[PDB]
Amino acid sequence: MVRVSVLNDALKTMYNAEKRGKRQVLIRPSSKVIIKFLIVMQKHGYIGEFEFVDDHRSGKIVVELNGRLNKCGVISPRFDVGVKEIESWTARLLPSRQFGYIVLTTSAGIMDHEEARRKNVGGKVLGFFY
Amino acid sequence: PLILIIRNRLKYALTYREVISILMQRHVLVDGKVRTDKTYPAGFMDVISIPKTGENYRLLYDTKGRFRLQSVKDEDAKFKLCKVRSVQFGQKGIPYLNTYDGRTIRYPDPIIKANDTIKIDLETNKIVDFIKFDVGNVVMVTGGRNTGRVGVIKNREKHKGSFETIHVEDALGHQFATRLGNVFTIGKGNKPWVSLPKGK
């Protein structure tokens, strides 16, 4: 299959762990998710070490919070890509109440729900980062 | 149809089963002729026409799409625009150019494709002008939600099987396109029919 879930699980598990950061292997779609996470300030930053020739890559993703509570109160997959459970621009069923965001690989790219909504695009939800 | 539309002008009260008398009183004309006929159909651009101390009306569409009468000037009453709905091609240069009202014309006159319109008087059954379906000309839209609006053609897109959409510049507000069937040409630089308030 797809990685996707591992990345997600790794993050929340990490938060509970109070781990400084986590690492794993990555793509454009799972860099893409990571970037959205950074954009909406879920994580401090992410890096993809060794990215040019070696057989693999990895991605050092740094978690945000440290202390008290953790930023990622809850993150869950719903349904990955290739796909079906599919939403429309308008169909957008959801969680939070706009507190959180839902990473949606849209048509356009992987963007957040709000952008896609604007973007006038539907796509396939990745997960509901809260 | 002629009955429905004259009957539409009435809708205050008290005809319909009595209907028959209006026609008999020979006070109704369609395109400058006598018809007294209960099953008669009429359609867009027909000119319909009342007494004696009387008036003239043009069949038009309202913004939704039903056919309704509108008061028309005597000057305008003289003319009618006929859309070329189909063609059986040929002779010499004659297509048999069918028009929307159901009129035949065989032959020249200098042009001519479907969606072009012919400006015709009434008495003689003479063709004054041809209004080409092309960019820069003005059109009125015959049906739909989009109905009852006018615009200038910005561009036409042609595809396989049929010429799909006609794009309009216009609006007092903004741009819109419709399929060709919808488009009825009403004006060119040389000759317009347009003097009727406006519009999205």
């Binding site: 440290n66 202390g67 008290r68 509570l69 953790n70 109160g73 809850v74 939070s96 706009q98 | -």
Partner: protein, 263 residues
């Protein structure tokens, strides 16, 4: 009732805010608990880099360190000791001395009830439960009752006689009480499903409710709460799940608001 919701800003995010404020701290994460140990170690390295030791005690230092050992002392909180809750309710008064202590004139298992103030107390229900012994099988009773002030915490207690159980029960709910932040005129802050065992206990913000969690709804000071609690009509469990909801709220604003620490 409705729906996301909107307006206004700060006003709106007020109420229970303080319990929110402190409380954000005290669960998770490295500060707070969860277990907090090595996370201490990881903590020690930062703080030094920051405030800085001035290196023979002197003036400055003596203060600073005790300004550190207080986030640490605070960190301990596992939300069964008053802190966050306390400051909100009021307070001052002789009575306050007695509660922090130690048994002065009063307090043995008591003394928080006076302080909170007026409020309705209604019996939810009383139930049986029959437990079989050598000579004869001894009828008991277990009564679940709520007076609640403005937070939420349900109580089940029993006694071999019907009347004594409730009296002590009334204290029992008011002490060890946790304030969910409502956010609207009796509306939940964000949708949460809380579950213990095989009960599927979801709440979302729509209309009125029915049964066991309806009388609970009224007493937390909710007025529109659409609670689909399904997997048992067994009433003792139904209230119990719902209490775990109404104390560990964990809406976004909770996650973001954290920056600050207190004496």
């Amino acid at each position: 009732m409705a729906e996301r919701g909107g307006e206004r800003g700060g006003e709106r995010g007020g109420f229970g805010r303080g319990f929110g404020r402190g409380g954000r701290g005290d669960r998770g994460g490295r500060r707070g608990g969860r277990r907090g140990p090595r996370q201490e170690e990881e903590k020690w390295v930062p703080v030094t880099k920051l405030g800085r030791l001035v290196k023979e005690g002197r003036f400055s230092k003596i203060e600073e360190i005790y300004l550190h050992s207080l986030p640490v002392k605070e960190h301990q909180i596992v939300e069964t000791l008053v802190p966050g809750l306390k400051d909100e309710v009021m307070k001052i008064t002789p009575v306050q001395k007695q509660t922090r202590a130690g048994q002065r004139t009063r307090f043995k298992a008591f003394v928080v009830v006076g302080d909170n103030n007026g409020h309705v107390g209604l019996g939810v229900k009383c139930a049986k439960e029959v437990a079989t012994a050598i000579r004869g099988a001894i009828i008991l009773a277990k009564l679940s009752v709520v007076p609640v002030r403005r937070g939420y915490w349900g109580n089940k207690i029993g006694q071999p006689h019907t009347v004594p159980c409730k009296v002590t029960g009334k204290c029992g709910s008011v002490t060890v009480r946790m304030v969910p932040a409502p956010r609207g005129s009796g509306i939940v802050a964000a949708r949460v499903p809380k579950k213990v065992l095989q009960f599927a206990g979801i709440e979302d913000v729509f209309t009125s409710s029915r049964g066991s969690t309806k009388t609970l709804g009224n007493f937390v000071k909710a007025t529109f709460d659409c609670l689909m609690k399904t997997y048992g009509f067994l009433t003792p469990d139904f209230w119990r799940d719902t209490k775990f909801v109404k104390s560990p709220f964990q809406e976004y604003t909770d996650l973001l608001a954290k920056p600050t620490k207190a004496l």
